[PDB]
Amino acid sequence: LPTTTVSLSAETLPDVQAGSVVLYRKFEVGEVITVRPRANAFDIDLHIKPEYRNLLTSNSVFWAEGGAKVQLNGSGLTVQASPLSRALKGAISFDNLSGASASQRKGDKRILYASETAARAVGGQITLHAFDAGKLAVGMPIRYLGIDIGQIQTLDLITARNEVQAKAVLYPEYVQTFARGGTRFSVVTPQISAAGVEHLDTILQPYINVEPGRGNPRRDFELQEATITDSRYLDGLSIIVEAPEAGSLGIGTPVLFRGLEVGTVTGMTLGTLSDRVMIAMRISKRYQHLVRNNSVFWLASGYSLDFGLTGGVVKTGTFNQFIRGGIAFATPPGTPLAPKAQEGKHFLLQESEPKEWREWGTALPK
Amino acid sequence: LPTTTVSLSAETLPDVQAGSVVLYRKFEVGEVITVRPRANAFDIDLHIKPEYRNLLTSNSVFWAEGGAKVQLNGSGLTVQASPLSRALKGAISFDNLSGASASQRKGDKRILYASETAARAVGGQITLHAFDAGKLAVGMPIRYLGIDIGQIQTLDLITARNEVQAKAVLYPEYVQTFARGGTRFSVVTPQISAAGVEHLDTILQPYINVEPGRGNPRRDFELQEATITDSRYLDGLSIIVEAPEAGSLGIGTPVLFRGLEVGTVTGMTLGTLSDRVMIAMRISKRYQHLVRNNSVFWLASGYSLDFGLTGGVVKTGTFNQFIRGGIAFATPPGTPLAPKAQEGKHFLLQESEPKEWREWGTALPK
């Protein structure tokens, strides 16, 4: 009987027997010897060949792969039964991960995770409180600008507090950047309507989008409904326009200057005294020089058709403001240009769309 | 010929035969001896090894394994055939469930369930009365906030009472929270329209949504058409507005304050004297302090175009109130603020949309 190089441990051993092949992520380097239950878990004894024992380091993670799989995707039809023992008794893969052996490996032994993802789920652990786990799933990736930052580990249903606590994890090189005071998460869902489709990849692979923030390390967040997808306006002038009613505005609605997209709406609070919606926006740092201290903001949301007694021409356009209610810019004329707007600046939505706007032509140098 | 440890019983024999391995939830602890029918039910005799005969307790459920594991995710079709040494041999599995063996595994013998899920279906049994079983199916999950609470077990067609009695089951940890006076169930269906899609995961995997309630143990409910999906507004102020006509309102239409969703509409009854539709609402516990005792509610449903004599501008916006007719708040100004509204409070839908609302600016501290 071969000597046990390493001994794993797992409740509900994931389809492994005596004789399952142990392969270094693509290449057989050992074999499973014995499987013995102890109290309520199982000891799984591996035997790495002596000329490959160097591949087994301290920060190694093991996971089961099962038998043959016939994955069919864009890469053609890839069959995976390359060793006869994998397709007959199962397999156990392993790899060397940087950042493992932190708080889950010491004291008894390593753990044979049931899948490949569950082994990769290493790093700082956060807690995502959500109101409905219908959009969530175990192992769902957490992404920033399309790159995976971490994943969801569990989905608990707390019933006293009627919410779902989803424990996630951020990979160790992102736990410092994210997991700060003001980061926000939200499940990206497909958007199929008459006015176009987007996020069609989230039909079969939904993910969680993240928007970072500055502040104290939090490690305990709340899943939101929407989030700015791209970081085009992450840096840049943050300002706040006050409106007596939010209405057609939402997160991500564009902020327009002369009809070009300049910034987006990031949040719609309700103010301390609940009498004004504090619409928080982020003007791009490329157009930060346009937000002067006397700029007037107005609501370019939907169509505003004209009217005339003897004659009134009507205008339609095709603006996405009828799809996502935009906010519009203006700078009134004057030779001593008002100073640039600071960060903590509060404007007021002028519901009137100043009629002499198009003939202003205020010079705004960079 | 080994000795028979436990005798089973199953209908529609699931591809197991003499020699099939009995594995302890993944670990082989015995084998099937013989498969015989006696009157109409296949008896199936097992033989657990003597060192594992303690793992077979009173609350142990058996189920037939087998079959591939197709998995349609973002990386392809990915059919899996994890075992082969046992796949071509057949394998029934078993495990000890906390709360099993209530009134069904005792008296004659256990039952070999055709799949793993049907075996786990243990707990308190409820009866859902439906009007159309076209949306339901045996084994369909019952979810609360997305976590499975139980599942459907049967689908009977009572012809006397022209309805369908669908016996379900709630897992023993949730049979106390639900199975109360005010819980309501409803099948969640895909909604694909020009206004957008949602619940696209119910195309291949529908479920039944639950909203808990406070009341006496019921154990006998009726399936409904709509339910509040998330528990964002479960805890919170639940008030009632009276209207001469419901019309555009329905379960789930938002309750708006300055245009922000603050609550939802949870029910539309008709009242004792059938002359006033009683729209039941739930204001969130976060914005509960806004519902003052003198607040005026109005109907922000659809679009309402203007009409002017000398100069009249028409507005369209982009409101989802044209999709889900919203109800809006207002609090008239006053220095001795009226007290906060209690739970059983009855307002009146003032259809006029108070004209000077946007200039009220009532300070509502928290």
Phi, psi torsion values for A99, nearest 5 degrees = 105, -10
Q: Which residue stretches of chain A are H helix? A: 86-89, 116-120
Contact B196, B146 (CB under 8 A): no
- State the residue for tokens 């990386």: B75
Are A345 and A242 in the same domain? yes
Say how far apart CA A206 and CA A199 lie, in whole Å. 9
C-alpha distance from residue A256 to each of A207, A252, A322, B270, B350 (Å): 29, 12, 14, 47, 36
CA distances from B319 to A258, A268, A325, B91, B313 (A): 24, 16, 9, 57, 18
First to last CA, chain A: 78
Contact B147 A132 (CB under 8 A): no
> Quick one: B138 and B63 in the same domain?
no
Q: b/e per residue, B161-192, with b = 16+ CB within 10 A?
A: eebbbbebbbbbebbebbbbeebbbbbbeeee
Number of domains in chain A: 3
B232 Cβ under 8 Å from any chain A Cβ: yes
Q: Of A122, A150, A166, which residue sits at a domain end?
A: A122
- Asked whether B81 and A69 are in contact (CB, 8 A), the reply is yes
Q: Using CB atoms, pick whichever of A14, A155, A277 lies closest to residue B260.
A: A277
The two three-digit tokens of residue B98, written as one number: 């906390």
Q: CA torsion A10→A11→A13→A19, rounded to 10°?
A: 50
Domain match, B42 and B30 both: yes
The CA–CA distances, whole Å, from A324 to A140, A255, A296, A303 equal 28, 10, 20, 12
Residue A327 structure tokens: 């906010």
Select the residue from B318, B323, B331, B353 to test the A interface by mutation, using most A Cβ atoms within 10 A.
B318
A143 min Cα distance to partner chain B (Å): 15
What DSSP string runs through B226-269? ----SSTTTSEE--EEEES--TT--TT-EEEETTEEEEEEEEEE
Cα–Cα dist B190/B358, whole Å: 38
Q: Do B316 and A322 touch (CB under 8 A)?
A: yes
Q: Check CB contact of A194 with chain B, cutoff 8 Å.
A: yes
Is residue A187 within 8 Å of B230, Cβ to Cβ?
no
Q: Kindly state the DSSP code that residue A274 receives in the 8-state scheme.
A: T
Q: Report the alpha-carbon distance of residue A308 to residue B304 in Å, rounded.
A: 19
Same domain, B274 and B350: yes
| DSSP SS3 for A202 | helix
Tell if the CB–CB gap between B313 and A301 is shorter than 8 Å.
no
Separation in Å, CA of B220 to nearest CA in chain A: 22
Q: Does A15 touch chain B (CB under 8 A)?
A: yes
Inter-chain contacts counted by CB atoms under 8 A, chains A and B: 191
Q: B113: closest CA among B84, B153, B143, B150? A: B153
Find out whether A85 and A15 touch, Cβ atoms under 8 Å: no
Residue A19 vs residues A7, A46, A86, B167: alpha-carbon distances, Å: 14, 9, 9, 45
Q: What is the DSSP string of B59-93?
A: TEEEEE--S-B---BTTB---B---STTTTT-EEE
A98: β partners: none
- Which method resolved this structure? cryo-EM
Between CA B137 and CA B142, with CA B139 as vertex, the angle to 5 degrees is 95
- Compute CA A148 distance to the chain's CA centroid, rounded to the nearest angstrom: 8
Give B38→chain A minimum CA distance, Å. Answer: 34
Q: What resolution (Å)? A: 3.0
The position carrying tokens 């976060």 is B286
Closest by Cβ to B194, choosing from A133, A193, A301: A193
How would you label A292-329 residue by residue, b for 16+ Cβ within 10 Å and e otherwise? beebbbbbbbbbeeeeeeeeeeeeeeebbbbebbbbbb
Strand B184-188 and strand B191-193: the pairing is unpaired
Same domain for A14 and A85?
yes
A13, A93, A128, A162, best to mutate vs chain B, most B CBs in 10 Å: A162
Q: If you write DSSP's letter for every residue of B150-167 in order, what string do you get? A: EEE---EEETTTTEEEEE
Structure tokens at A28: 């057989």
Cα angle B53-B56-B57, degrees, rounded to a multiple of 5: 125
- My answer on whether A242 and A348 are in the same domain is yes
- State how far the Cα of B196 lies from the Cα of B322, in Å rounded to an integer: 13
Nearest in space to B178 (alpha carbons), one of B133, B205, B207, B210 = B210
The enclosing H or E element of B328 equals strand B326-328
Which residue do the tokens 């199975």 mark? B179
Per the listing, tokens 């403001």 go with A321
Residue B51: helix, strand or coil by DSSP? Answer: coil
- List, in sequence order, every residue forming a beta bridge with A76; answer none if it has no partner: A73
Three-state SS for A144-160 is ECCEEEEEECCCEEECC
One domain, residues A234 and A211: no
Task: Kindly tell me the sign of the dihedral angle through the C-alpha atoms of A121, A127, A130, A132.
Answer: positive
Q: Which amino acid is at B232?
A: R
B198–A189 CB contact, under 8 Å: yes
Nearest residue of A to residue B177 by CA position? A159
Asked whether the beta carbons of residue B196 and residue A193 sit closer than 8 angstroms, the reply is: yes
Both tokens of B60, joined, read 């142990």
Buried b (16+ CB within 10 A) or exposed e, A72-87: eeeeeeeebbeeebbb
Co-location of B68 and B53 in the same domain? yes
Closest chain B residue by Cα to residue A88: B84
Please tell me if residue B134 touches chain A, with a CB cutoff of 8 Å: no
Which phi-psi region, left, alpha or beta, contains residue A218 (left: φ > 0; alpha: ψ -120 to 50)?
alpha
Counting beta carbons within 10 angstroms of the beta carbon of residue B140, is it exposed (0 to 12), middle (13 to 18) or buried (19 or more)? buried
Smallest Cα distance from B309 to chain A, Å: 8
Question: Do residues B30 and B52 lie in contact, with contact meaning Cβ atoms separated by under 8 Å?
Answer: yes
3 state DSSP class of B271? coil
Tokens of B171: 């897992």
Extract the tokens encoding B338: 């009226």
Give the separation between CA A306 and CA A292, rounded to whole angstroms.
30
Contacting residues for B166 by C-beta, under 8 A, at least 6 apart: B127, B128, B129, B130, B133, B136, B152, B153, B154, B155, B156, B223
Q: What is the DSSP letter of B188?
A: E
Question: Residues with Cβ < 8 Å from B208, sequence gap 6 or more?
Answer: B128, B136, B140, B141, B142, B143, B152, B168, B185, B186, B187, B188, B223
Residues 6+ positions from A321 with CB-CB distance below 8 Å = A253, A254, A256, A300, A301, A302, B318
Cβ contact A163–B145 (<8 Å)? yes
Which residue is listed with tokens 């799933």? A137
Tokens (6 digits) for B235? 């805890």
Q: How far is B162 from chain A (nearest CA, A)?
A: 33
Question: Do A365 and A236 belong to one domain?
Answer: yes
Q: What share of chain A is helix, strand, coil (3-state, %, to 5)?
A: 5, 35, 55
Is residue B58 packed enough to be buried (19+ CB in 10 Å), middle (13-18) or exposed (0-12)?
exposed
Chain B positions in Cβ-Cβ contact with residue A322 (cut-off 8 Å):
316, 318
Q: Which residue of A has its CA nearest to B87?
A: A88
Asked whether the beta carbons of residue A88 and residue B87 sit closer than 8 angstroms, the reply is no
Q: Which residue of A has its CA nearest to B362?
A: A275
Residue in chain B lying closest to A194 (CA): B194
For CA atoms A199, A203, A207, A213, give the dihedral sign: positive
Q: Which two tokens stand for residue B166?
A: 């669908």
Chain A residue with Cα closest to B77:
A72
Helix (H/G/I), strand (E/B), else coil: B22: strand
Q: How many residues does chain B have?
A: 366
3-state SS, residue A191? strand
Report how far residue B106's alpha carbon sits from residue A131's, in angstroms, rounded to the nearest whole number.
Answer: 40
A237 and A360 part of one domain: yes
**What is the sign of the dihedral through the CA atoms of B192, B197, B201 and B202?**
negative
Whether residue B26 and residue A37 make contact (CB cut-off 8 A), yes or no, is no
Distance, in Å, from the CA atom of A247 to the CA atom of B260, rounded to the nearest integer, reads 7
Q: Which residues of B touch A13 (CB under 8 A)?
A: 26-27
Judge whether B310 is closer than 8 Å to chain A, CB to CB.
yes
Residue A312 phi, psi (nearest 5): -140, 115
- Pick the residue from chain A with its C-alpha nearest to B331: A275
Residue B260 sits in the same domain as residue B162: no
Smallest Cβ–Cβ distance between B27 and the set A35, A247, A309 belongs to A35
Q: Cβ contact (<8 Å) for A277 and B290?
A: no
B313 → closest Cβ in A70, A194, A307 = A307
Nearest to A163 among B231, B365, B366 (CB): B231
Residue of A nearest to B149 (CA): A157
Q: How far is the C-alpha of B282 from the C-alpha of A300, rounded, in Å?
A: 32
Q: Which two tokens stand for residue B286?
A: 């976060």
CA distance B219 to chain A (A): 19
State whether residue B274 sits within 8 Å of chain A by CB.
no
Rounded CA-CA distance B262/A250 in Å is 15
DSSP assignment string, A53-119? GGG--SSEEEEE--S-B--EETTEE--B--STTHHHH-EEEEEE-TT-SSSSSSSS---EESSHHHH
What DSSP element (H or E) covers A185? strand A184-187
Q: Mark yes or no for CB contact A155/B174 under 8 Å.
A: no
Domain stop point among A91, A122, A153: A122
The residues facing A240 across adjacent strands are: A280, A346
DSSP conformation class of B297: B
Q: Please tell me which residue of chain A has the smallest CA distance to B262.
A: A270
B246 and B147 within one domain: no
A246 with B260: Cβ contact below 8 A: yes
Query: Please, which residues 31-90 of chain A have a Cβ atom closer than 8 Å to chain B?
Result: 35, 37, 42, 66-74, 87-90
Which residues lie across from B73 on neighbouring strands? B76
Last residue of a domain, one of B105, B122, B139: B122
CA distance B139 to B150: 9
The Cα angle at residue B202 between residues B200 and B207, in degrees rounded to 5: 150
Q: Which domain range does residue B343 map to?
A: 228-366
CA-angle at B350, arms to A250 and B355, nearest 5°:
65
Alpha-carbon distance B150 to B173, whole Å? Answer: 10
CB-nearest to B147 from A131, A155, A192 is A155
CA proximity to B332, closest of B305, B351, B359: B359
